[PDB]
Ligand binder design. Sequence first.
Ligand code: ADP
Ligand code: ZN
Ligand code: ZN
Length: 185
Amino acid sequence: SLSLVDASWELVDPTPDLQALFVQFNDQFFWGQLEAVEVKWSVRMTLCAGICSYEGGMCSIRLSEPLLKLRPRKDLVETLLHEMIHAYLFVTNNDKDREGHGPEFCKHMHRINSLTGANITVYHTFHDEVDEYRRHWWRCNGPCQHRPPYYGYVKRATNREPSAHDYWWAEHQKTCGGTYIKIKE
Ligand SMILES: Nc1ncnc2c1ncn2[C@@H]1O[C@H](COP(=O)(O)OP(=O)(O)O)[C@@H](O)[C@H]1O
Ligand SMILES: [Zn+2]
Ligand SMILES: [Zn+2]
């Protein structure tokens, strides 16, 4: 069975094996196609539970140890599978939907949920979180997408774009110099 909803889905895993999960899911759900993709824990990241970075090539996934270590297994697994769908669309040159999570995303999302009983979702909060999260997102198109601890992200409560108004702006200009493309609000 490919079912993931077992006894232990709603419970914290003190010793997750992220590499093993990746290998398993590449084989079971992505037809082996994610060979070039790598997956790492971050002990530093907090703006996102999960991210991808694409060299535009090699694809990287990062999972937030701060946000996931104490959460139920299901949240690690659903976050990882969400990121692997983005990775798959990148690897297969099928990431041309206008939306972040357009029809292509929902096909894999819906399909993997069918196979496993999981609930991968198009939103990037946890199912139990309330509505007190920042909705306006930018991502830098410079090298800092790969750079810890923000991976290019800026998440704000209003449409307040990254600018010289920001205390960190001059630094980012020197250390990256990329431009902040609007994504969430
Ligand atoms: N040097 C940096 N380069 C790029 N982004 C940075 C840098 N320093 C901070 N940031 C951005 O600023 C955020 C921290 O801002 P914060 O101090 O929480 O104020 P705000 O209320 O504007 O979010 C980070 O999450 C990241 O998006
Ligand atoms: Zn996503
Ligand atoms: Zn940048």
